[PDB]
Structure 1
Amino acid sequence: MSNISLIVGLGNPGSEYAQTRHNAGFWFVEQLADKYGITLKNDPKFHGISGRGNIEGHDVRLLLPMTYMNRSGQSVVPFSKFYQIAPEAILIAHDELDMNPGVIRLKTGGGHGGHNGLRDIVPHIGPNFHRLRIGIGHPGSKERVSGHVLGKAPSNEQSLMDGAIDHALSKVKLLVQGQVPQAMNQINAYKPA
């Protein structure tokens, strides 16, 4: 029922990380920001890059922590405390190992699912924020997980992921308008065209 007023993209800073699957949440938020002409500027007070503007009739903040993934909470937590944004108004976009490329899900609540960014966030604001789980695949062995999240995907997997992200961006109107059950049905029904 509450409007989404803060959208957070999780990822690592620097050009060596920018195309890595771990930066799926940066992809989503950076595309969104540019779709609506919202400028992401350096915001060192909150250890991130941040912005604010109109999306489909609503005042929305955007945040990319520049803390490195595992310390994402050092940006998100004080940012959302300072602007007094309840967790229920936060959507956090992140890579999801447990879903394949081309799969994308909106989830409300729950835990971190082993994701090391969310792991740094859930303890401080609690679990009740919305999550855009952008599927990146699982390599297979738990050995190869680090090299997979920190690697660039091949073009085919990338096109599926980018398709998923395009679809979720088309649904942000619902989310910022408070229409979370509808956004969720519609996001979660996505399948590659």
Structure 2
Amino acid sequence: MSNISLIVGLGNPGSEYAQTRHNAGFWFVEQLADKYGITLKNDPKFHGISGRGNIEGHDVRLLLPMTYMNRSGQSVVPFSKFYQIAPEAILIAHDELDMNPGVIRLKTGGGHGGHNGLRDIVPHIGPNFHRLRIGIGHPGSKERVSGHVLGKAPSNEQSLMDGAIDHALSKVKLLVQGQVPQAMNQINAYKPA
């Protein structure tokens, strides 16, 4: 198994989106960046904010597309292509409507599952990258999906998601060191408090 060398977090730009569920992927990556002291800088060339540094003895790049969510591939695709990073060395963190807050899963391969950021990336790099699916809950009806993902979660749900994000954070070491099956067991085993 490939070491993970590029971690992407999906979301929308601007302070009006910063706290919305749709930016779960940004939360995980911003928090990872600061855990390891990796600086995220504007990288207009690749339509995003990005950084690079040592995480647990491996050199990792971190990317947040600034394209808006549905256009995320306009940053992820040229960036991974420019640094010749294979999909199998990519982890993409993203909000997951199909799992509750406090649930988190590592998945390798498969399609976008309706996620409009992943929809914009699978076509161009293929599906064989890893995903950190951060459960955000489903509001109970298709009509309310949009106001849900584009909405700020209440405190209780936010704690659960943060709890799940902290757990995955503690597993990145396995991920960057190539132990994906171990990481998968250990991330996927998470249940809150």
Whether 2:169 is the aligned partner of 1:179: answer no
- Unaligned regions of 5+ residues in structure 1, if any? none
Q: Tell me how far apart the structure 1 counterparts of residues 69 and 124 of structure 2 sit (CA, whole Å).
A: 16
Root-mean-square deviation (Å): 0.2
Whether 2:72 is the aligned partner of 1:80: answer no
Q: Tell me how far apart the structure 1 counterparts of residues 101 and 42 of structure 2 sit (CA, whole Å).
A: 30
Deviation per CA, 1:46-103: give whole Å up to 9, x if none.
0000000000000000000000000000000000000000000000000000000000
Q: Tell me how far apart the structure 1 counterparts of residues 20 and 29 of structure 2 sit (CA, whole Å).
A: 15
- Unaligned regions of 5+ residues in structure 2, if any? none
Q: Tell me how far apart the structure 1 counterparts of residues 148 and 141 of structure 2 sit (CA, whole Å).
A: 10
TM-score (norm 1): 1.00
Shift of 1:183: 0.1
Q: Tell me how far apart the structure 1 counterparts of residues 159 and 81 of structure 2 sit (CA, whole Å).
A: 36
Deviation per CA, 1:110-162: give whole Å up to 9, x if none.
00000000000000000000000000000001000000000000000000000
Where do 4+ consecutive residues of structure 1 move more than 2 Å?
none
TM-score (norm 2): 1.00
Q: Tell me how far apart the structure 2 counterparts of residues 33 and 124 of structure 1 sit (CA, whole Å).
A: 26
Q: Tell me how far apart the structure 2 counterparts of residues 98 and 185 of structure 1 sit (CA, whole Å).
A: 19
Whether 2:32 is the aligned partner of 1:18: answer no
Deviation per CA, 1:8-65: give whole Å up to 9, x if none.
0000000000000000000000000000000000000000000000000000000000
Q: Tell me how far apart the structure 2 counterparts of residues 66 and 77 of structure 1 sit (CA, whole Å).
A: 13
Q: Tell me how far apart the structure 1 counterparts of residues 117 and 144 of structure 2 sit (CA, whole Å).
A: 19
Equivalent position of 2:162 in the other structure? 162
- Count of aligned pairs: 193
